[PDB]
Design a protein around this ligand. Structure first.
Ligand SMILES: CCCCCC/C=C\CCCCCCCCCC(=O)OC[C@H](COP(=O)(O)OCCN)OC(=O)CCC/C=C\CCCCCCCC
Ligand SMILES: [Fe+2]
Length: 630
């Protein structure tokens, strides 16, 4: 049976669906008082049908067990003794669970007709792997309680990896061009903007600019030729505390809201860092200017200033770009969808796959990552109550329309490949955005023939109402026609899939090594550009506990690829197609066209990567999950 809009469904359909929605609303319940994320709309609890499937669980547990084994193996034999039996037991039990899963799958295959008799056993396996994860929880608590015993000046930052290979950034982090390239190809491709005139509170002058870029360049010429780009972290607010923040677990930490200027040379061959101010007030933050190789008295001040930017970057990236603007946005769309679009509504069928695992992973962020003494309280400088409030405020202020990729690119004046040629997030992102848009256009056209079909759809009206109201999605507005609906669906889908991928999957290769990036520093911003030493810079590096949590959490969160954009098949048993409607699934139809377009996009991106200075692979469709689930 094809899905239907409520105004067209037959009566038995209409009453069945309104009763289903009355039921859904008892199961999927809004709160703004979820523990550790006050003010953000959340599910009160995760319904049974929203727990992760076995396939996700085995993937996630697999990575976690690899990390446990790696940790235990890095310990001295004496310390390892406390944990070896437990670690061996987790490995063996996970393997046992894989085998149960594989047996169940082969049993279903031997008699597909009898496969419904297996569903309790499939949920029993889900329960079992979740219980395995509870045991992991207990082991993590124990490791952390014994952190003192277990846990060029940087050897401790290598040691925490065990036998995991250090990422490339461990080699290249001090390099100026590499630093600049984070701005366009790193986990946070969103903050960088063109600058036409400098902020008043960033008094970089003509003479300083020419010192760096050459006597034949100028601020005026560079600005006018679209060669100046600014990173300004003012929006971090309380994520950049004024001073020292003393915590029990990590001692004294600092973070920052700096401003940094980058420029292209006249040949536009690449972005170069020009100047950094380590906070918003120039009266208390001197100007650091890019030093020449011979200026050994400026060298370490400049390394310190870049580390200041990178501290700000982890705070901005993780709390805003990643948690607030992917995870916590998709939370709202998940809840509105289940509460207001009947399961037989075609938009429910389309969107549900894009929220698989979202409620679960988000409850995990709040319960595990955000309480006092949790990962974020360890890894991020600000008091945890300030972090929670600031991330939440950022989610609440995120404008849905202004946040769409093309609008973002335009508002920041970074949408012109002629002016800023090397911007992989922009160029690959647009390919994926546009492919999704055509799919959304095609799919909408199946079910909505007129703008009348959009305005007369009472479920869609209720959905918009809940997204605006209970969901507190800023900038969302009434949907009055088909083209608008398409732009909306494109954004909801892109957000859930590609955007999350682009800002989540860089975590292992770019964020696991604390000297290259960390959301806390152990020292104030450099007080002068001149006369700093390696020892002054080393003082900024975090306590080892920070590094230990960092390598493990960022490896995990970027190593689970579950589901794939466009596949539209269940990702757990029985792995059936999402769509039944032959208008969607037919040969040469909307779905096949979307699938084929994504492979075209993949081929284009691979071609682009052969010619890039470094490959950018996060927006390869083959590496984009349909949902935000890790
Ligand atoms: C950091 C900023 C991220 C921002 C984005 C956050 C958004 C979404 C991500 C939310 C992710 C939520 C957390 C991951 C969820 C994993 C799937 C899951 O649900 O696992 C649940 C278990 C059990 O939970 P429970 O509450 O009973 O006990 C917590 C400890 N009191 O949690 C973990 O395995 C702990 C984290 C494993 C950390 C790495 C294992 C390290 C083992 C090796 C040695 C470790 C030494 C430390
Ligand atoms: Fe994520």
């Amino acid at each position: 049976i094809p899905p239907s809009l409520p105004q067209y469904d037959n009566l038995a359909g209409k009453l069945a669906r309104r009763a289903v929605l009355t039921s859904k609303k008892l199961v999927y319940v809004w709160t703004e008082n979820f523990a550790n994320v006050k003010g953000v709309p959340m599910a009160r609890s995760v319904p049974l049908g929203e727990l992760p499937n076995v396939d996700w669980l085995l993937k996630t547990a697999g990575v976690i067990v690899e990390l446990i084994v790696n940790f235990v193996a890095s310990l001295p034999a004496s310390a390892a003794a406390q944990f070896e039996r437990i670690a061996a037991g987790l490995s063996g039990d996970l393997e046992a669970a894989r085998q149960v899963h594989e047996a169940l799958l082969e049993e279903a295959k031997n008699d597909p007709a009898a496969a419904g008799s297996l569903l309790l056993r499939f949920t029993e396996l889900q329960t079992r792997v979740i219980a395995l994860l509870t045991r992991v929880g207990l082991l993590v608590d124990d490791i952390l309680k014994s952190a003192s015993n277990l846990v060029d000046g940087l050897n401790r930052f290598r040691a925490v990896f065990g036998t995991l290979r250090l990422p490339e950034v461990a080699d290249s982090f001090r390099d100026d061009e590499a630093f600049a390239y984070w701005r366009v190809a790193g986990p946070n491709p969103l903050l960088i903007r063109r600058v036409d005139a400098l902020p008043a509170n960033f008094p970089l002058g003509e003479e300083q600019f020419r010192r760096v870029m050459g006597a034949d360049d100028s601020l005026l010429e560079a600005a006018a030729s679209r060669r100046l780009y600014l990173l300004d972290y003012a929006e971090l607010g309380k994520l950049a505390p004024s001073g020292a923040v003393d915590k029990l677990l990590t001692g004294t930490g600092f973070a920052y809201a700096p401003i940094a200027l980058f420029a292209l040379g006249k040949d536009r061959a690449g972005l170069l860092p020009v100047a950094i101010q380590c906070g918003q007030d120039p009266a208390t933050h001197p100007m650091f200017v890019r030093p020449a190789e011979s200026e050994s008295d400026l060298y370490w001040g400049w390394q310190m200033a870049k580390t200041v930017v990178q501290v700000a970057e982890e705070n901005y990236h993780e709390m805003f770009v990643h948690l607030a603007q992917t995870h916590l946005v998709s939370e709202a769309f998940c809840l509105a969808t289940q509460r207001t679009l009947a399961p037989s509504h075609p938009l429910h069928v389309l969107l549900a796959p894009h929220f698989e695992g979202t409620l679960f992973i988000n409850e995990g962020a709040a319960r595990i990552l955000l309480p006092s003494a949790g990962f974020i309280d360890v890894m991020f400088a600000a008091p945890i109550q300030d972090t929670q409030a600031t991330a939440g405020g950022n989610r609440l202020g995120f404008d849905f329309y202004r946040g769409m990729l093309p609008e973002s690119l335009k508002a920041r004046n970074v949408d012109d490949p002629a002016a800023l040629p090397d911007y992989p997030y922009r160029d690959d992102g647009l390919l994926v955005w546009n492919a999704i848009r055509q799919w959304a256009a095609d799919y909408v056209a199946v079910y909505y023939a007129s703008d009348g079909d959009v305005t007369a759809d009472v479920e869609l009206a209720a959905w918009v109402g809940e997204v605006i109201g209970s969901g507190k999605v800023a900038g969302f507005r009434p949907i009055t026609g088909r083209s608008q609906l398409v732009e909306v669906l494109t954004m909801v889908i892109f957000t859930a899939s590609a955007q999350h991928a682009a800002v989540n999957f860089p975590q292992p290769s770019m964020m696991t090594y604390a000297p290259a990036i960390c959301a806390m520093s152990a020292a104030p911003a450099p007080d002068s550009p001149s006369g700093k030493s390696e020892a002054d810079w080393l003082k900024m590096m975090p306590p080892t506990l920070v590094a230990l949590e960092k390598v493990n959490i960022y490896h995990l969160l970027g190593s689970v690829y579950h589901g794939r954009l466009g596949d539209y098949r269940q990702t757990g048993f029985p792995y059936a197609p999402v769509f039944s409607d032959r208008r969607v699934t037919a040969s040469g139809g909307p779905l096949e066209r979307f699938q084929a377009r994504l492979k075209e996009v993949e081929a284009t991106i691979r071609t682009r990567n052969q010619a890039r200075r470094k490959p950018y692979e996060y927006l390869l469709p083959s590496r984009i999950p349909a949902s935000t689930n890790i």
